[PDB]
A paper describes a structure:
Four new structures of HaPE555 were determined (resolutions: 1.57 Å, 1.67 Å, 1.73 Å and 1.95 Å). The largest peak of HaPE555 (555 A) is by far the most abundant PBP constituting approximately 63% of the overall protein complement (with other HaPE555 spectrotype peaks contributing 8%). All five crystal forms of protein HaPE555 are constructed from continuous filaments of PBPs, which are organized into two-dimensional rafts. The filaments are generated via knobs-into-holes packing but differ in the distances between adjacent molecules along the filament (having either tight or loose interfaces). This packing brings the chromophores of neighboring PBPs closer together increasing the possibility of energy transfer. The bulk antenna proteins, HaPE555 and HaPE560, are densely packed to form a concentrated glass of proteins as evidenced by electron micrographs and FRAP experiments. It is also possible that the rafts of HaPE555 filaments seen in all crystal forms are part of the organizing principle of the antenna architecture. We have shown that HaPE555 and HaPE560 form the bulk of the light harvesting antenna (roughly 6/7 of the PBPs) and capture the highest energy photons. Thus, HaPE555 and HaPE560 have evolved to capture photons that would be otherwise lost by the integral membrane photosystems: they plug a spectral hole.
Numbering used by the authors:
A (entry chain F): 1 to 64
B (entry chain D), D (entry chain B): 16 to 177
C (entry chain A): 2 to 64
Write the structure that this text describes.
């Protein structure tokens, strides 16, 4: 069921084939450079983004 | 949190079709989640500016914020559907009962439908590199099958809320 | 400059609409206004790096 | 972490009209830091694509990432100077030792100069209503003084880094 808890699956894709590693981020086995992270997280309210959409919604952007 | 690399990721890429293109597609959604949601909710408003007039569905930062939150939640469930080639999670933990709750709050189905269709168009535009401010940094090829699959997931959302 | 990527992150709050998050009253006042400043490490963002590498030649924002 | 509110907040702004415009000006930097930085570093490369050819200044994601990081670091110290009306923290914790560190690293000064210059122009644009995709949600009026001030901080950065 939809739990009314604002929780959503947050997926993160990693392609580190250039070899650049950040310290402490090796959380799994492999050395092809690829990883996927999945975790449930709550999605929060963003007063700033809301204020921006409220002022600028009438501006077409991105070449849409 | 699951971390999926090395041999587990090579396995994942076998129980899903077009593994490498699929991951590029997922990345294209999650990497752009904020502007997809912003541009989609902006477009539902600019097509029906009454939504943001007094006591409309997204008047006041709180209502507008709850909307942007909801669209991001939905988008992320779709992103997870495309990761696994499977919408069971989206159905179970997003869709089931969502119309019931929105009908009680009267979050209008028409503004939702339009926010959903713009998110789909936006996501499909990224996956096909028809997006104009940003292109993906992917090898060139045909991602039409996955574009259609993810459109299908947005369509389950539209259908459930209609 | 300590080579620790830390920078003053300034956050401006305007909650004059009355919508409040529980527990976020950290200073005195009844304005709705608050400025918060903390030193935080600014991190590397490989995604944005990739994007600028691909898309730098697209004029955006009407700039 | 410091919190400035009530009377604490009003010793920050000192005088009525300009102080509000200052808070709005600082809000506009931090609320748009990401795109400011992306557009300024993009403009750098735009004007000198050789910065992204082999062994150029921002060739490889690591270097590009480090540059975008630095641009935001700098932008944020500038936002703090504009909040506090003095450059002291920017000088001692951001600029002091910075050019010599760049020298050893091999970060090209010219590129820094143009990132800073575009960052300046972008921030002034927001403050003087010359921004075209996104307007600030402030009462209309003239902030030419706060544009001059923040230009000063950016020119301080330029003078040390160019
Ligand atoms: C994520 C932001 C983005 C980047 C970056 C990029 O390169 N493209 C981006 C977004 C994007 N949007 C669309 C399609 C639409 N966007 C809107 C809303 C805006 N249209 C308005 O009229 C307006 C109010 C004045 C908006 C705000 C709409 C309506 C669409 C069309 C959706 C539809 O029904 O077909 C896309 C899709 C590709 C394109 O450029 O059109 C993308 C990628
Ligand atoms: C946060 C992004 C943004 C929004 C939103 C908005 O409304 N304006 C925004 C950014 C912005 N940029 C500038 C000015 C410049 N941007 C560039 C880089 C781009 N020019 C290119 O040629 C290029 C590659 C093709 C780009 C990438 C440049 C050069 C400028 C001008 C710098 C100068 O010396 O004047 C502004 C300032 C006002 C304006 O729109 O021109 C803003 C607000
Ligand atoms: C209601 C659902 C709103 C909304 C409110 C949020 N505020 C959040 C964090 C936050 N707000 C303040 C300002 C408040 N605290 C004070 O002490 C005073 C002045 C005396 C003010 C006006 C602060 C300081 C903070 C951070 C507190 C801390 O650092 O621990 C918040 C969480 C996200 C965030 O940190 O910005 C929310 C949701 N947000 C909305 O979208 C609606 C309109
Ligand atoms: C719509 C999706 C795009 C399109 C995508 C393509 N990707 C292709 C090959 C490819 N992509 C990756 C990265 C990917 N694999 C992973 O495991 C992960 C992270 C966990 C990611 C982010 C790889 C490694 C590869 C293969 C190695 C390489 O080719 O460098 C591809 C070529 C066909 C194919 O391999 O299936 C395409 C078409 N291309 C487009 O034009 C649209 C916009
Ligand atoms: C070098 C500085 C790069 C860069 C690297 C970063 N990666 C960050 C987070 C991260 N990366 C992975 C993938 C990695 N871990 C694995 O186990 C595997 C293979 C099995 C790989 C390919 C993961 C899982 C994560 C998140 C770790 C977590 O969930 O805690 C990252 C951010 C660290 C931070 O923000 O604190 C960086 C900087 N980023 C760059 O821009 C350059 C090109
Ligand atoms: C240049 C920055 C801008 C612009 C700024 C103006 N703001 C004006 C009035 C105003 N702004 C605020 C919000 C500000 N005060 C705070 O304490 C904080 C902290 C969160 C913030 C965000 C207030 C409270 C006020 C005064 C109330 C009002 O007049 O609505 C303003 C008019 C100055 C005056 O009334 O004498 C300006 C010009 N306006 C522009 O057109 C550019 C884009
Ligand atoms: C934007 C596209 C809409 C708009 C949306 C609003 N939703 C509001 C409250 C709300 N949203 C949900 C579903 C949400 N919670 C979850 O856990 C998940 C999935 C896991 C989802 C997708 C619920 C249960 C609720 C009620 C409780 C809450 O706010 O957390 C909302 C505020 C309505 C109110 O204040 O009663 C809005 C404004 N509004 C629109 O006009 C457009 C069409
Ligand atoms: C972008 C406009 C430039 C660009 C910038 C680069 N900086 C690189 C590494 C780096 N930058 C700093 C200063 C930085 N760290 C701090 O703590 C502070 C201030 C609080 C800031 C301003 C440091 C210490 C470092 C060393 C790496 C680290 O400790 O994180 C960098 C990588 C250089 C390399 O090793 O190849 C770049 C590319 N590069 C450009 O071409 C444009 C003009």
């Amino acid at each position: 069921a939809m739990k009314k808890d604002s929780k959503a699956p947050c997926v993160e894709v990693f392609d580190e084939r250039d070899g650049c590693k950040a310290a402490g981020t090796q959380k799994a086995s492999g050395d092809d450079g690829f990883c996927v992270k999945v975790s449930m997280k709550a999605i929060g309210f963003n007063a700033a983004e809301a204020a921006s959409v409220t002022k600028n919604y009438g501006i077409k952007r991105f070449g849409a | 949190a699951a971390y999926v690399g090395g041999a587990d990721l090579q396995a994942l890429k076998k129980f899903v079709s077009e593994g490498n293109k699929r991951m590029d597609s997922v990345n294209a959604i999650v990497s752009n989640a904020s502007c997809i949601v912003s541009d989609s909710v902006s477009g539902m408003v600019c097509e029906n500016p009454s939504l943001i007039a007094p006591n409309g569905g997204v008047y006041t930062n709180r209502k507008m914020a709850a909307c942007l939150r909801d669209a991001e939640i939905i988008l992320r469930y779709v992103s997870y559907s495309l990761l696994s080639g499977d919408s069971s999670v989206l159905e179970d933990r997003c869709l089931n009962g969502l119309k019931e709750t929105y009908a009680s709050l009267g979050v209008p189905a028409a503004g939702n439908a339009r926010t959903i269709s713009i998110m789909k168009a936006t996501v499909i535009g990224f996956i096909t590199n028809n997006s104009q401010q940003k292109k993906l940094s992917t090898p060139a090829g045909d991602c039409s099958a996955l574009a259609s699959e993810v459109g299908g997931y947005f369509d389950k959302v539209s259908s459930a809320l209609a």
